[PDB]
Design an enzyme around this catalytic site. Structure first.
Site, PDB file in Angstrom:
ATOM      1  N   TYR A 159       0.833  -1.196   0.000  1.00 54.92           N
ATOM      2  CA  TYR A 159       0.000   0.000   0.000  1.00 54.92           C
ATOM      3  C   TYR A 159       0.868   1.247   0.000  1.00 54.92           C
ATOM      4  O   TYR A 159       0.649   2.173  -0.789  1.00 54.92           O
ATOM      5  CB  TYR A 159      -0.942  -0.001   1.207  1.00 54.92           C
ATOM      6  CG  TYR A 159      -1.737   1.280   1.333  1.00 54.92           C
ATOM      7  CD1 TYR A 159      -2.814   1.532   0.493  1.00 54.92           C
ATOM      8  CD2 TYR A 159      -1.402   2.244   2.274  1.00 54.92           C
ATOM      9  CE1 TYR A 159      -3.540   2.710   0.588  1.00 54.92           C
ATOM     10  CE2 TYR A 159      -2.123   3.429   2.379  1.00 54.92           C
ATOM     11  CZ  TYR A 159      -3.192   3.656   1.533  1.00 54.92           C
ATOM     12  OH  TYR A 159      -3.918   4.829   1.630  1.00 54.92           O
ATOM     13  N   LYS A 163       1.253   4.165  -2.769  1.00 57.90           N
ATOM     14  CA  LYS A 163       0.918   5.554  -2.458  1.00 57.90           C
ATOM     15  C   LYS A 163       2.077   6.492  -2.776  1.00 57.90           C
ATOM     16  O   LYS A 163       1.872   7.577  -3.332  1.00 57.90           O
ATOM     17  CB  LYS A 163       0.516   5.687  -0.988  1.00 57.90           C
ATOM     18  CG  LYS A 163      -0.754   4.950  -0.603  1.00 57.90           C
ATOM     19  CD  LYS A 163      -1.966   5.476  -1.355  1.00 57.90           C
ATOM     20  CE  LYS A 163      -2.248   6.934  -1.026  1.00 57.90           C
ATOM     21  NZ  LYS A 163      -3.459   7.463  -1.726  1.00 57.90           N
ATOM     22  N   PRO A 186      -3.040  12.743   4.488  1.00 56.08           N
ATOM     23  CA  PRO A 186      -3.521  12.544   5.852  1.00 56.08           C
ATOM     24  C   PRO A 186      -2.992  11.246   6.443  1.00 56.08           C
ATOM     25  O   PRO A 186      -2.452  10.383   5.750  1.00 56.08           O
ATOM     26  CB  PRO A 186      -5.042  12.499   5.687  1.00 56.08           C
ATOM     27  CG  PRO A 186      -5.228  11.933   4.335  1.00 56.08           C
ATOM     28  CD  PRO A 186      -4.081  12.442   3.490  1.00 56.08           C
TER      29      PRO A 186
END
Ligand code: NAP
Ligand code: NAP
Lengths: 316, 314
Positions: A159, A163, A186
């Protein structure tokens, strides 16, 4: 003026869309299925009937995105799958979804001559770096070491790789002319849900509320309210003199201490109580706060999430 | 005698024409749609059955204006779009509307041999100047820096460029033909038209309290009924010319909310804000002609009263 929102039926994207409707924007939201129950919660939004236009697009289908984006002044790329703890994902295809979808979105905006793009990334693209020293408070200048996640196995390794790669692609794409590309990263996002299904971050918050006996890591969670993220995205879009990354992680606590304040604000649940046992836990959201962003206290986020949990019947 | 009025269906223009009908004038009103729905509030004004004559004209269609204007002793150019905040406008086309529409009206007036024109401008064409010092009380001879408005981003910046450029062009053209300009502040008052305008929208904004912390702006204020009678006074008076400032009152939005709560309780007024010296512009040039505006408290309480009856607070 019209702005596009990828994955409008998502946890974050629903609040983004609700907020932008409340401010007079015309929204083009993309979804992978237009069935009434999937899109119900979006159709009900105030202003949606007249200023919400939902398309059926997929991040890996350049044409469908082109159709949804054409004519839009901006676009908020929020669509990236977020794996759950209680499942398995294929890193290969998540990396494929994130990077290739981003490339497609970016190509479509250059085609549609979109002026500004805002990619929603994560602190997972900032913090996962073993080489950065301890006396260093990480900020928008710190990147995650692709090497490290590719080397060492830990849940959400792929992940994070996806990202960071997608955010590097987007940011670097932004230094041509006529195209300003922002990124917002965030941390763990909590808050009341608009969509009918529960997302991943809210599920691990819910996991801490249905106590168990297994021994968990007493991780340090950094947290942000989803409504605050949405208003941050609004703020970053409307203000022109913006550029680069913006971290949005106002709060941060040990899972130990999060259970206890939850227990203090919302008694009546057999919370989990079996943990064991840094620095980076204090990244400065100030680049955002200097624009006027004022997050709400963690207590309200917490209490409003738990009651939406109850309304969804997730606690019996 | 006949007088023309541009955009008679507007917030200000509606009060302008009702007053002028109240005074025996024959008024030629301009609108962009003659449907009974949008003109109803005008048909009902007493005198309109016999002395109101509505034409279908657009400011960027010169001949439409020519047709509505020819035969009138005076003109009252009040048609200029003013954006609401919870939408977006194209500044390019707004300022183009205002200046070219103003030019077209003036060309039509000298072609029809009109004798007096009254252009409705704004304080936006007077105050927005970074060069003007703080020691200086601005009056009718301080203009807005249009470059600054085009450099600095703020909602209503293009609007300010429009009003200043249009008012510049109007009085320049007046040296060709008596052209007067009135520059009002933020305009509040009861509404005659069915749809709410923008200034009353932001008062309704201040009335429906929330949690977002808005700018504690310093609003300069004038009543729409006072603007109408000022326009009447300026037109009837034959010893008038140049600019005339009409902005009797001025307060911080927080102090404004408390005087409103003081006159109209029972509503969840907004009460979180944040954080001058241009706040004392002299309306004396008008007040020396007999213009006596009403206290602001009447204007606001009557405006919220009409808000109530229009069902805008639920
Ligand atoms: N939740 C967090 O804690 C957190 C923290 C940091 C960053 N973020 C980022 O916030 C963004 C939104 O995630 P979320 O929190 O709202 O969780 P989420 O509800 O699971 O978001 C998934 C969204 O992405 C869409 N999606 C997945 N694959 C797609 C594809 N091939 N084509 C088009 N759409 C696709 C989904 O469409 P469907 O509705 O059809 O499934 C859905 O709308 C993500 O980019 C995430 O990295 C989240
Ligand atoms: N509202 C305030 O607080 C304020 C403050 C300072 C100055 N002013 C000035 O007062 C004047 C009127 O504004 P308002 O307060 O009455 O708000 P408003 O009701 O929105 O006035 C808009 C008027 O302008 C007409 N209009 C716009 N574009 C037009 C076009 N191309 N052709 C013909 N008509 C056009 C509109 O016609 P339709 O009715 O058919 O749409 C309408 O009648 C403006 O000149 C403004 O600069 C207003």
């Amino acid at each position: 003026s019209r702005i596009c929102v990828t994955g409008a039926g998502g946890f974050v994207a629903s609040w983004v869309v609700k907020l932008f409707l409340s401010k007079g924007y015309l929204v083009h939201g993309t979804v992978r299925d237009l069935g009434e129950e999937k899109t119900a919660h979006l159709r009900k939004l105030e202003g949606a009937y007249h200023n919400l236009q939902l398309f059926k697009a997929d991040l890996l289908d350049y044409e469908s995105l082109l159709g949804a984006i054409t004519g839009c002044d901006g676009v908020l790329h929020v669509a990236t799958p977020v794996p759950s703890s209680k499942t398995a994902y294929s890193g290969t295809e998540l990396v494929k979804t994130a990077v290739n979808g981003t490339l497609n979105v970016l190509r479509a905006c250059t085609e549609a001559k979109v002026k500004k793009v805002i990619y929603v990334s994560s602190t997972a693209a900032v913090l996962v770096n073993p080489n950065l020293p301890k006396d260093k408070i990480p900020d928008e200048d710190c990147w995650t070491d692709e090497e490290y996640c590719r080397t060492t196995p830990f849940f959400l390794n792929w992940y994070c790789i996806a990202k960071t790669a997608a955010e590097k692609n987007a940011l670097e794409y932004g230094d041509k002319e006529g195209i300003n590309v922002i990124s917002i990263c965030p941390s763990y996002i909590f808050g009341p849900m608009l969509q009918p299904t529960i997302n991943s971050s809210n599920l691990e918050l819910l996991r801490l509320m249905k106590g168990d006996d297994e021994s968990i890591e007493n991780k340090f969670l950094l947290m942000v309210d989803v409504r605050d993220v949405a208003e941050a995205i609004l703020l970053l879009y409307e203000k022109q003199e913006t550029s680069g990354r913006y971290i949005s992680s106002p709060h941060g606590m040990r899972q130990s201490n999060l259970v206890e304040k939850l227990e203090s604000l919302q008694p009546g649940y057999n919370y989990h109580k079996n943990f064991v046992d840094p620095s980076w836990t204090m990244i400065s959201s100030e680049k955002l706060k200097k624009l006027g962003w004022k997050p709400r206290p963690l207590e309200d986020t917490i209490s409003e999430t738990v009651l939406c949990f109850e309304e969804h019947g997730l606690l019996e």
